[PDB]
PDB file of C-alpha atoms in Angstrom:
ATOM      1  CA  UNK A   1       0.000   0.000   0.000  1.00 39.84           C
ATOM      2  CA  UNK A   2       2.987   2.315  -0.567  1.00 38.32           C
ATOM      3  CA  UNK A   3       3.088   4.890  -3.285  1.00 40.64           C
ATOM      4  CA  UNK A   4       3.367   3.293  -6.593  1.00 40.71           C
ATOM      5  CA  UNK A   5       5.732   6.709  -7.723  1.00 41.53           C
ATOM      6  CA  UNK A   6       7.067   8.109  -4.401  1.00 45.12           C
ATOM      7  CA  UNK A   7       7.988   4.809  -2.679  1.00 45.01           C
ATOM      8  CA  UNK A   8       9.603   4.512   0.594  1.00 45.04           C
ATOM      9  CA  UNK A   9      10.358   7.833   2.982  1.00 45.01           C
ATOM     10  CA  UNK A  10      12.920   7.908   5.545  1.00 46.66           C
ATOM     11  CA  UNK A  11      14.475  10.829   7.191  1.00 44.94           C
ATOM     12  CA  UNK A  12      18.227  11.913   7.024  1.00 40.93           C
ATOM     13  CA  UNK A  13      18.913  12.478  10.825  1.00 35.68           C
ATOM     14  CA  UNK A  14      21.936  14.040  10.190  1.00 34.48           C
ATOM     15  CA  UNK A  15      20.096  17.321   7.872  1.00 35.62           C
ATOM     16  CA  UNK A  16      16.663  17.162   8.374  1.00 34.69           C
ATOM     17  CA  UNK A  17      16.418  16.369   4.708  1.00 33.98           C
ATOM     18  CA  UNK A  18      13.755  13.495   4.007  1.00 35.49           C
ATOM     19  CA  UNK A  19      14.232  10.410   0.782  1.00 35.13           C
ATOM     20  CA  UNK A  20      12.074   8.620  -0.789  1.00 33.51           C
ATOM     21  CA  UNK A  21      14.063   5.741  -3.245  1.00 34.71           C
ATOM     22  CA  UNK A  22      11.310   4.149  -5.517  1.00 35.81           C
ATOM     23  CA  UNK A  23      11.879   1.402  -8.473  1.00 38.66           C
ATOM     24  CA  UNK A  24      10.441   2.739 -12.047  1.00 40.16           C
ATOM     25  CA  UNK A  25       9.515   0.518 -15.205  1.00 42.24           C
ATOM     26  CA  UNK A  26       8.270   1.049 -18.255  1.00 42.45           C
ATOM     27  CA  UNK A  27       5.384  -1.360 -17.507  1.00 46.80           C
ATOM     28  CA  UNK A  28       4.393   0.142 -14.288  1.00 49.56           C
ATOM     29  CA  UNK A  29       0.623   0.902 -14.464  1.00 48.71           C
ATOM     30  CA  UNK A  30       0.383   3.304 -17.542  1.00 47.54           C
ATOM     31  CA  UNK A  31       3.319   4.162 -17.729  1.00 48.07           C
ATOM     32  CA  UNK A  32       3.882   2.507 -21.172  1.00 48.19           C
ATOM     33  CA  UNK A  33       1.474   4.415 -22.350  1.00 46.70           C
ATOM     34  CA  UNK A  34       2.216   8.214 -22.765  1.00 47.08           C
ATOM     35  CA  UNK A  35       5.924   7.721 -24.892  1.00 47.13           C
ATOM     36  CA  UNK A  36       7.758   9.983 -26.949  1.00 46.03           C
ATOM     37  CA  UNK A  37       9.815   9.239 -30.194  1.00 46.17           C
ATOM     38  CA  UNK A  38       9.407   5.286 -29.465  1.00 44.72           C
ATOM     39  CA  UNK A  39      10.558   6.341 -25.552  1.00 43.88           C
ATOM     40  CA  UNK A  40       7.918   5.978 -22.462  1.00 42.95           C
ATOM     41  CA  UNK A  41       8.689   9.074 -20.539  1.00 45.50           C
ATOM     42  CA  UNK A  42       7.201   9.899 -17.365  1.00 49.23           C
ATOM     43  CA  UNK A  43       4.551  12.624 -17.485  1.00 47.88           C
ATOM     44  CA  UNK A  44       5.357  15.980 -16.370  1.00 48.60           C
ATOM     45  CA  UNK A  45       2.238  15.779 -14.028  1.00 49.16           C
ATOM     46  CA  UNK A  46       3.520  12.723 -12.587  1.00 47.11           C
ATOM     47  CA  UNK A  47       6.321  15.472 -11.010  1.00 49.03           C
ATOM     48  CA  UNK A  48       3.039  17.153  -9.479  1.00 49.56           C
ATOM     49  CA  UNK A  49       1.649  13.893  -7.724  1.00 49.56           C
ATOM     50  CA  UNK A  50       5.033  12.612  -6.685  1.00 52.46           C
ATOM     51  CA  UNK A  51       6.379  16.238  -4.902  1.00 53.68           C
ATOM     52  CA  UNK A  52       2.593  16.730  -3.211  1.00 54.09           C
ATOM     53  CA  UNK A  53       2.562  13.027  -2.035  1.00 52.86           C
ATOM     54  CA  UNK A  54       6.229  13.601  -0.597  1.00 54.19           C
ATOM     55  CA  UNK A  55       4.748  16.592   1.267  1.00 51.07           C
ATOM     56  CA  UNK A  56       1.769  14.621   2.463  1.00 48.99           C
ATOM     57  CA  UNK A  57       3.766  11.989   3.934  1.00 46.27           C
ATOM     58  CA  UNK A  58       6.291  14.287   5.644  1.00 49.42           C
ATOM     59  CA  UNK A  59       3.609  16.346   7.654  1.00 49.47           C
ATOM     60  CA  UNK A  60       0.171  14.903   8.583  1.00 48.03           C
ATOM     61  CA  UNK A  61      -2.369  17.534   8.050  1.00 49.08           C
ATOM     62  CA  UNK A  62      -6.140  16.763   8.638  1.00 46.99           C
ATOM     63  CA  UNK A  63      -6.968  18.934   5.353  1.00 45.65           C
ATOM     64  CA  UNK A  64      -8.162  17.394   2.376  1.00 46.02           C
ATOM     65  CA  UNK A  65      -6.698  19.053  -0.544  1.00 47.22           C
ATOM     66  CA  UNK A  66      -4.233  20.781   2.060  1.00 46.50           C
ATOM     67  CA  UNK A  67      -1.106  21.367  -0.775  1.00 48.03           C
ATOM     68  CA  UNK A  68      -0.671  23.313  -3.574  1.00 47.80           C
ATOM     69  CA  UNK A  69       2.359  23.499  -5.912  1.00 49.42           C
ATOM     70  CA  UNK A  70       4.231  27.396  -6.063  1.00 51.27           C
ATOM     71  CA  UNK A  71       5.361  26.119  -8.499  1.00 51.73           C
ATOM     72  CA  UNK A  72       7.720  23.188 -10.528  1.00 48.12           C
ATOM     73  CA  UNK A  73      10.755  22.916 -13.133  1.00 47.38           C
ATOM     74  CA  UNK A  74      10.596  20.409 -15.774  1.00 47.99           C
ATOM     75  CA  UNK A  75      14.287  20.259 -15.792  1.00 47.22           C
ATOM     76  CA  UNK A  76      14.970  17.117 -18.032  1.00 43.41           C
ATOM     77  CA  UNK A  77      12.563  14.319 -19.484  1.00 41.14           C
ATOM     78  CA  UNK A  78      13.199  11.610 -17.508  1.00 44.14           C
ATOM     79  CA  UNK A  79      13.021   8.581 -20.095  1.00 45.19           C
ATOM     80  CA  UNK A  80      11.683   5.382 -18.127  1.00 43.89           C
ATOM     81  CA  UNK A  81      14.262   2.627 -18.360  1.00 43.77           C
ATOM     82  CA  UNK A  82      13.872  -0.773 -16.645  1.00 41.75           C
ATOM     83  CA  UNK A  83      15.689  -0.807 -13.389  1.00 42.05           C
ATOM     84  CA  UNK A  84      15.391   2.491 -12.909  1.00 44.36           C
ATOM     85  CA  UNK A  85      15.490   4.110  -9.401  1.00 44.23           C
ATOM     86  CA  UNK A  86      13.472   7.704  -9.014  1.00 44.26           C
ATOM     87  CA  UNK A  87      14.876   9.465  -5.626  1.00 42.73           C
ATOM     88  CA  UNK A  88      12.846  12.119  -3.967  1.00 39.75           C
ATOM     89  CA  UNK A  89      14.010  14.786  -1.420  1.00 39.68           C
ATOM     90  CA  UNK A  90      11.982  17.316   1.042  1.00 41.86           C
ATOM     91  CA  UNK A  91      13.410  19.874   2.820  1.00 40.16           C
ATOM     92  CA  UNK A  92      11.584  23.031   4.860  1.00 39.39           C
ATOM     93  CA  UNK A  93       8.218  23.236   7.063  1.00 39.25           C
ATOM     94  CA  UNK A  94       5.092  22.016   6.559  1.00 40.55           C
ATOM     95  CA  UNK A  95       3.731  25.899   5.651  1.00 42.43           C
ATOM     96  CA  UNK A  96       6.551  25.543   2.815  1.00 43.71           C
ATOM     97  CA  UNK A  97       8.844  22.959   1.150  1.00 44.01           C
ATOM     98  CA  UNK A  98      11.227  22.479  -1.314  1.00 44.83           C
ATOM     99  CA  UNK A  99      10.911  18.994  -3.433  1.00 46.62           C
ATOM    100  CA  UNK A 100      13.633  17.508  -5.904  1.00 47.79           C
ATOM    101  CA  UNK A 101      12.912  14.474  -7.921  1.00 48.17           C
ATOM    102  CA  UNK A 102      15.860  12.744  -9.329  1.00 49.31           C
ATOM    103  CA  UNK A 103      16.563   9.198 -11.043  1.00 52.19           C
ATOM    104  CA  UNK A 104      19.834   7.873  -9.440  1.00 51.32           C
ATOM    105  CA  UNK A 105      22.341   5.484 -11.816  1.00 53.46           C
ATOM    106  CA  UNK A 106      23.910   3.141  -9.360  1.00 53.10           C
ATOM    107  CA  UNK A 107      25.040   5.252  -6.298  1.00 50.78           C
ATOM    108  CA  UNK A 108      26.918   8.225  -6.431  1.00 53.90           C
ATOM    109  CA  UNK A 109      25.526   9.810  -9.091  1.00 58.45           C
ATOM    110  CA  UNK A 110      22.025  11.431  -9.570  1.00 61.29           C
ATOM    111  CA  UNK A 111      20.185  13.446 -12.222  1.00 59.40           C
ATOM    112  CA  UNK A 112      17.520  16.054 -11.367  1.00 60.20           C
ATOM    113  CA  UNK A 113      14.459  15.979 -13.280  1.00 60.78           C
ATOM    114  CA  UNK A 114      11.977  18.711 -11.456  1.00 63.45           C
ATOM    115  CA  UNK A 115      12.175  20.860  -8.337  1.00 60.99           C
ATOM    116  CA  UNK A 116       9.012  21.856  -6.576  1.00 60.21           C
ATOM    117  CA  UNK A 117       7.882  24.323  -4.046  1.00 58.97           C
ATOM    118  CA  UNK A 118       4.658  23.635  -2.152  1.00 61.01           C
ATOM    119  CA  UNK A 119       2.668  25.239   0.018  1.00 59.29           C
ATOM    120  CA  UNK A 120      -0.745  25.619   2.110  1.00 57.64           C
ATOM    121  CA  UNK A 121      -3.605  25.302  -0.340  1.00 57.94           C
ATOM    122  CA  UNK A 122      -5.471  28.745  -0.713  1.00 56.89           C
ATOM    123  CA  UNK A 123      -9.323  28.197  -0.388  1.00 54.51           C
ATOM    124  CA  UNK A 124     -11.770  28.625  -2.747  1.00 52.81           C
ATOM    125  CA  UNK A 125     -19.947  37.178 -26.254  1.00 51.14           C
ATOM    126  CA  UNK A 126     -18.885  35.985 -30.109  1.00 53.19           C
ATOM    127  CA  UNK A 127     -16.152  33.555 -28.562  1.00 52.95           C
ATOM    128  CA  UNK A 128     -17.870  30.493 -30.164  1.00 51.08           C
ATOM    129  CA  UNK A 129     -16.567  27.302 -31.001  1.00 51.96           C
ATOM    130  CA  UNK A 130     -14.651  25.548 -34.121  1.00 50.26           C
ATOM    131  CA  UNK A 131     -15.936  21.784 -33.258  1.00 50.23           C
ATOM    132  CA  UNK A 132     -12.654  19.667 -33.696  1.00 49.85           C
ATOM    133  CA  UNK A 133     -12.045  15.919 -33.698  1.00 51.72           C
ATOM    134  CA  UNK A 134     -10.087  14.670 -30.648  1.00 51.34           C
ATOM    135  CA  UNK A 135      -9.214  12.063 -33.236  1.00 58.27           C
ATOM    136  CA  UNK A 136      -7.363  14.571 -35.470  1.00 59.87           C
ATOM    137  CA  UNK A 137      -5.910  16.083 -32.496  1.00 61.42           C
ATOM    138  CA  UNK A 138      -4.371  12.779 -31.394  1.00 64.76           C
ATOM    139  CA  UNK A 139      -3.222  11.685 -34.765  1.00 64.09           C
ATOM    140  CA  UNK A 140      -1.275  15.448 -35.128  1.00 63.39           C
ATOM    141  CA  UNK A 141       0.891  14.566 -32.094  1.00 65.86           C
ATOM    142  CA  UNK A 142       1.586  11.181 -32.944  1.00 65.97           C
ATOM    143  CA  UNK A 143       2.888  12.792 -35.663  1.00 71.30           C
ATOM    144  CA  UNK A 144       5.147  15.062 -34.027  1.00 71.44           C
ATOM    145  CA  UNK A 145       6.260  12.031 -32.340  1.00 76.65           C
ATOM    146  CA  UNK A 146       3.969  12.408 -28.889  1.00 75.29           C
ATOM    147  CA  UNK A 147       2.538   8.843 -28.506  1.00 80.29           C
ATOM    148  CA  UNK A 148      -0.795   8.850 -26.122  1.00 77.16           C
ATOM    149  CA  UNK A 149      -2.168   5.378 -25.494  1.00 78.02           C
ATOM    150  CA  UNK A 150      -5.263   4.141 -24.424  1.00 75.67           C
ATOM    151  CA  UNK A 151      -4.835   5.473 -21.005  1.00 78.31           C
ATOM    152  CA  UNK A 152      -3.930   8.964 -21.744  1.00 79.08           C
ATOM    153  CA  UNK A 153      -6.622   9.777 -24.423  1.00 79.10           C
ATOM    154  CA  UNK A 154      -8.830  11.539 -21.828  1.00 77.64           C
ATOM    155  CA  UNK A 155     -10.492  14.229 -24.735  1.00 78.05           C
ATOM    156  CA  UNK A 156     -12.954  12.791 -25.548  1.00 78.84           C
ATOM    157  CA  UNK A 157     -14.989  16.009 -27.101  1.00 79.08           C
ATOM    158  CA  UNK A 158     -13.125  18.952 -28.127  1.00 77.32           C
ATOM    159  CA  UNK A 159     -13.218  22.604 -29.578  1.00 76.26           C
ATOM    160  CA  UNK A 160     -11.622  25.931 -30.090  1.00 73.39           C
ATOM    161  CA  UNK A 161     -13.158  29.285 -29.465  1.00 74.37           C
ATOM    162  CA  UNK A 162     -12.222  32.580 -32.055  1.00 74.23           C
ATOM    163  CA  UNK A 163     -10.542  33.730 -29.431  1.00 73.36           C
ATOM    164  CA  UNK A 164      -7.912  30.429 -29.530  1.00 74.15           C
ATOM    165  CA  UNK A 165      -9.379  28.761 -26.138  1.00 73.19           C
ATOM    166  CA  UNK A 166      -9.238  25.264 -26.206  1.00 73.61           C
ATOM    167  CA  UNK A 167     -12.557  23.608 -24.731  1.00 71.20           C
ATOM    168  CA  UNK A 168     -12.303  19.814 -23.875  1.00 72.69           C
ATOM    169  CA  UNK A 169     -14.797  17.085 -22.822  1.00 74.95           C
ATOM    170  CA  UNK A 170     -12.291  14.169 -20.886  1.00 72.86           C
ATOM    171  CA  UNK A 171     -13.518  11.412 -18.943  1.00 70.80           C
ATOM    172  CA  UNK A 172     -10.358   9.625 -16.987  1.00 67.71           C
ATOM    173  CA  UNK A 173      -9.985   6.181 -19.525  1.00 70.48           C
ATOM    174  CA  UNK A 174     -10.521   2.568 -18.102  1.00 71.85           C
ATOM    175  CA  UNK A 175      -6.538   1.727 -18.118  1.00 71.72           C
ATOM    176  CA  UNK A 176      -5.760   4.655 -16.190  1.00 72.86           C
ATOM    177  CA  UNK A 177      -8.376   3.774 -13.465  1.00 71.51           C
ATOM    178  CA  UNK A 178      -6.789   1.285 -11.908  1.00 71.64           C
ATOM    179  CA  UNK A 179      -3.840   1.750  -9.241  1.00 73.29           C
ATOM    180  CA  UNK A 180      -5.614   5.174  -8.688  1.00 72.18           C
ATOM    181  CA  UNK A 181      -6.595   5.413  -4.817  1.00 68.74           C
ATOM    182  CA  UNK A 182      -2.903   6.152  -3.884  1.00 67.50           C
ATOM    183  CA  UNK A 183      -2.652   9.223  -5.630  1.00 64.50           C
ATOM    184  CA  UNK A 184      -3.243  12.829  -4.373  1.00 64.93           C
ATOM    185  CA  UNK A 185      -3.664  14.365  -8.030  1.00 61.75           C
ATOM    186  CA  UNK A 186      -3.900  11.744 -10.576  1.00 63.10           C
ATOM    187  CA  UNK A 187      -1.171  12.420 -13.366  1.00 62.67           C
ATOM    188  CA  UNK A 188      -3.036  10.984 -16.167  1.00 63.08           C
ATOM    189  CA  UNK A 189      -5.968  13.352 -15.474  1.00 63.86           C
ATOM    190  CA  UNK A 190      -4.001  16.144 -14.948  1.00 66.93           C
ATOM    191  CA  UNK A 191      -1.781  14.890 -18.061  1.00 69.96           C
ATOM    192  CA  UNK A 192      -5.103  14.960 -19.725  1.00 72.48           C
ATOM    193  CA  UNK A 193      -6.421  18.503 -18.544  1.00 71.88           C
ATOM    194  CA  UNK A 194      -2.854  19.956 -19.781  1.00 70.63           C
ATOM    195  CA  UNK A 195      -3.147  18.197 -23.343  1.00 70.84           C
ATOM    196  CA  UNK A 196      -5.851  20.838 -24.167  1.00 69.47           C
ATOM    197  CA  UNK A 197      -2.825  23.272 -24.913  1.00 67.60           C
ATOM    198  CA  UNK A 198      -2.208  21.423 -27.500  1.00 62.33           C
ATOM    199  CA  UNK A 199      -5.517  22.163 -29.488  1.00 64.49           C
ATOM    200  CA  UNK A 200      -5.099  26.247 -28.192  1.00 61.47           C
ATOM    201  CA  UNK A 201      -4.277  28.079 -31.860  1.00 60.90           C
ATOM    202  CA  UNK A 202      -0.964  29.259 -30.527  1.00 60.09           C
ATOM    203  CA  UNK A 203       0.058  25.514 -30.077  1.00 60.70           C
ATOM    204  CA  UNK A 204      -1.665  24.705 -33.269  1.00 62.02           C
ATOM    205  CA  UNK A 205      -0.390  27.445 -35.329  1.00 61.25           C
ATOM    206  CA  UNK A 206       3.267  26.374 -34.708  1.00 59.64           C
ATOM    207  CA  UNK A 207       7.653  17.890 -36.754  1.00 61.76           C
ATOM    208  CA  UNK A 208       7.647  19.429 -33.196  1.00 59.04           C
ATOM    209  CA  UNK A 209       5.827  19.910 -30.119  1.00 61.52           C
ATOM    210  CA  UNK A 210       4.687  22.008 -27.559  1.00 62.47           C
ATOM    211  CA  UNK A 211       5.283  20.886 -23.886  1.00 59.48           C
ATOM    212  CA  UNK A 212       4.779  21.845 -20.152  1.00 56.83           C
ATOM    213  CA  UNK A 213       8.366  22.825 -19.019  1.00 55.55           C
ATOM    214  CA  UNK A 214       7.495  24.903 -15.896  1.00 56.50           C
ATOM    215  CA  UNK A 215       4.232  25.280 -13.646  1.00 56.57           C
ATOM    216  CA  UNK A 216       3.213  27.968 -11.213  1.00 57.72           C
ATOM    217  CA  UNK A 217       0.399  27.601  -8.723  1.00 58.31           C
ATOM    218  CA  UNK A 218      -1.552  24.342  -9.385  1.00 59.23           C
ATOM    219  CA  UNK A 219      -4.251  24.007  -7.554  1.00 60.53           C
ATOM    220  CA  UNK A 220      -6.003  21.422  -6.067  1.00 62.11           C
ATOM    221  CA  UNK A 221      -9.529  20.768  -4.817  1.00 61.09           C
ATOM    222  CA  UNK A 222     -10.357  17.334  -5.579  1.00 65.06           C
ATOM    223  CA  UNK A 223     -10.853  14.301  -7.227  1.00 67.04           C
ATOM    224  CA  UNK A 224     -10.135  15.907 -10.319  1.00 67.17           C
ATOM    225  CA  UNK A 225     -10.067  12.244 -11.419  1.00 69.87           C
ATOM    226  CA  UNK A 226     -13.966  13.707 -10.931  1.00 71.44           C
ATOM    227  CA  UNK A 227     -12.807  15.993 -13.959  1.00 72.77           C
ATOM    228  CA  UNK A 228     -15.281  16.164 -16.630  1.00 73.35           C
ATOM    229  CA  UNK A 229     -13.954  19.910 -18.879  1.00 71.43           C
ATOM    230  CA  UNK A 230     -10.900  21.196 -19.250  1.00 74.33           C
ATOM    231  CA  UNK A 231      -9.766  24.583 -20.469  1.00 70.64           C
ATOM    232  CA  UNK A 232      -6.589  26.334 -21.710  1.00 69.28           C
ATOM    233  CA  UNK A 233      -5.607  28.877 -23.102  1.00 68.14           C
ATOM    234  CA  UNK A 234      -1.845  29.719 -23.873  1.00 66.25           C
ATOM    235  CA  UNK A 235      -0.562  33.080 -24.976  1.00 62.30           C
ATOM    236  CA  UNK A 236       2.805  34.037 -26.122  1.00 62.83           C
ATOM    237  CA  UNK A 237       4.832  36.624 -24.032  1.00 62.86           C
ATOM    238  CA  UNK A 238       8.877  37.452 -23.847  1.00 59.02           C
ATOM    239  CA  UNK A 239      10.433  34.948 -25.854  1.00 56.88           C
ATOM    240  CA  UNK A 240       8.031  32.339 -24.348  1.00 57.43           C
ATOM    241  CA  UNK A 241       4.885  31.089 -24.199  1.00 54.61           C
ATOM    242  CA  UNK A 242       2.267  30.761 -21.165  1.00 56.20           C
ATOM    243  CA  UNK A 243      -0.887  28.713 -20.518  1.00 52.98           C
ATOM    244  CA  UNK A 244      -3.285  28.656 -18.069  1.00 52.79           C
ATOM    245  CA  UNK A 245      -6.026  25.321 -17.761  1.00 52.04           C
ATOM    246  CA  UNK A 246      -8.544  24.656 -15.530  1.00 50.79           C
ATOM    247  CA  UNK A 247     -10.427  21.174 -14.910  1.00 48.61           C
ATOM    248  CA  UNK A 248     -13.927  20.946 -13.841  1.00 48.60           C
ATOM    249  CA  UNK A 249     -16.866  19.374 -12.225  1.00 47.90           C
ATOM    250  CA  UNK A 250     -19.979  17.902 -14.435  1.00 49.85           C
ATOM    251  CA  UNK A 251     -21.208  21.071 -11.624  1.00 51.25           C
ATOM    252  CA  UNK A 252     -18.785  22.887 -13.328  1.00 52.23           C
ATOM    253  CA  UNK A 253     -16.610  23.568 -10.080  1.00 51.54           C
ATOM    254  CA  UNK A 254     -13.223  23.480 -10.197  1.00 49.71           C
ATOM    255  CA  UNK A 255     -11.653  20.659  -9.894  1.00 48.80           C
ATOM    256  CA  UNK A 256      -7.218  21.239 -10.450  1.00 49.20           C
ATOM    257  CA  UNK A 257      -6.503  24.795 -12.066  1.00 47.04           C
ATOM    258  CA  UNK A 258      -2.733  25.504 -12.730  1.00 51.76           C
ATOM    259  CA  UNK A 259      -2.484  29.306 -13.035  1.00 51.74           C
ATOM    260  CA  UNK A 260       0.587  28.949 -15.094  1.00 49.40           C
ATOM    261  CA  UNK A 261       1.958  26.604 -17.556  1.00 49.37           C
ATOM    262  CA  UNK A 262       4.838  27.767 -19.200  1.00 47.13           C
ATOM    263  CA  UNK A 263       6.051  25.868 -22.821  1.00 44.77           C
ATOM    264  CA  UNK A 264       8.262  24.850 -25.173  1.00 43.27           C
ATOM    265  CA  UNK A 265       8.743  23.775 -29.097  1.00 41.58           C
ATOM    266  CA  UNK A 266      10.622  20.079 -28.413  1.00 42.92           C
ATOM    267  CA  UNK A 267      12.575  18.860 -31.546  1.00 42.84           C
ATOM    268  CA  UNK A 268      10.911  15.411 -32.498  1.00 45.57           C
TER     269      UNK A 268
END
C-alpha cells in the first residue's frame, strides 16, 4: 500500500532532509502508455503527484486538498528505463517545502528531473466554437512524435473558441483507473487537462511539439479524477509562451486549475 511513484520515505537524521528511493519501469501501471519518439517518458504531471505526495507523507495535516504546488521545473525528461530508481528529497516546514525528484544510476551519481515548491492550499460574447475531432488532435501529435495510449486519451470532445481557447470534454480512460486510490492528483488526469494546450491556436499554429516545461500555482480541490472539462488557453509573451487550464466538475466547479503553464517547441 505504498506509493506506486514516491515509494519509501525515511528521514536523514543528520540534515533534516527526508528520501524517498522508488523502483520505475516502463510497464508500471500506464506508464507505457504516454511515450515519446518510441521512448515511455514519465509525465510531467507525474512530477506534481510525486512532490505533493512527498509533502503529504512528511507532515500529517487533517486537510483534504491541504497542498498546492508554487510552483515546478521540468528540468529534463526523464526517459523510463527498466531498473530504474526515481529518488525524492523534502526539505523546509510544513507551511513551505522544497521537493527535488531525481533518477539515481547506481550510487553516487544522480540526475535532477523537477524541483518543486509547495505550500498551504489557498481556499476557494462571439467567442464560439470551431468543433474539432479529438481524433485529429491525437493523430497530429503522434505525428510530431507524442505517442498517447489508451490510457492517456482523456479528450474525448473537443473545440476551439475565435478567441484560440481550447474547450475539452475528458472522462479519466478505463486503463488509467486502476492503481488510482494512492494518488493525491492523478497524473493521467491532470496529463489529460494539460493536453488541451495542445488544441489552443498558438500551439496549433506552430515535426515538433509544444510541452509543459514549468508550472506555477496548481491548484487542487479534488478528485479531479472527478474531472469532466478542461480549459486552456496559452498566450505568447517574452520569448516564451504561457498557458493557463482549468479542470472541472460535471457542476462545473473546479476541480485542479494551474495558473501557469509555461512551454516549449521540443525537436521530435
Amino acid at each position: 500500500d505504498t506509493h506506486p511513484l514516491l515509494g519509501v520515505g525515511v528521514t536523514d537524521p543528520t540534515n533534516g532532509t527526508r528520501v524517498w528511493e522508488s523502483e520505475l519501469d516502463p510497464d508500471l501501471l500506464w506508464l507505457a502508455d504516454h511515450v515519446i519518439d518510441d521512448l515511455v517518458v514519465l509525465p510531467g504531471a507525474a512530477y506534481a503527484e510525486i512532490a505533493l505526495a512527498a509533502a503529504t507523507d512528511t507532515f500529517a495535516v487533517e486537510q483534504d486538498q491541504p497542498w498546492m504546488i508554487s510552483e515546478l521545473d521540468l528540468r529534463q525528461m526523464l526517459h523510463v528505463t527498466p531498473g530504474t530508481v526515481l529518488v525524492t528529497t523534502l526539505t523546509g516546514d510544513e507551511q513551505r517545502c522544497q521537493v527535488e525528484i531525481r533518477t539515481r544510476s547506481g550510487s553516487s551519481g544522480w540526475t535532477t528531473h523537477a524541483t518543486a515548491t509547495v505550500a498551504r492550499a489557498e481556499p476557494l460574447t462571439a467567442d464560439l466554437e470551431d468543433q474539432l475531432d479529438p481524433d485529429d488532435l491525437y493523430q497530429r501529435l503522434r505525428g510530431a512524435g507524442q505517442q498517447h495510449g489508451p490510457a492517456f486519451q482523456g479528450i474525448v470532445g473537443l473545440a476551439v473558441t475565435q478567441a484560440g481557447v481550447a474547450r475539452a470534454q475528458v472522462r479519466l480512460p478505463a486503463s488509467a483507473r486502476t492503481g488510482s486510490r494512492e494518488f493525491m492528483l492523478h497524473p493521467v488526469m491532470m496529463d489529460i487537462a494539460l493536453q488541451t494546450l495542445g488544441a489552443t491556436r498558438t500551439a496549433t499554429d506552430l515535426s515538433a511539439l509544444v510541452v509543459p516545461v514549468r508550472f506555477a500555482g496548481v491548484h487542487v480541490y479534488g478528485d479531479i479524477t472527478r474531472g469532466v472539462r478542461a480549459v486552456g488557453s496559452l498566450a505568447a509573451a517574452g520569448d516564451r509562451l504561457v498557458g493557463e487550464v482549468v479542470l472541472t466538475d460535471a457542476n462545473g466547479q473546479p476541480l485542479l486549475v494551474v495558473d501557469e503553464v509555461e512551454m516549449a517547441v521540443l525537436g521530435s
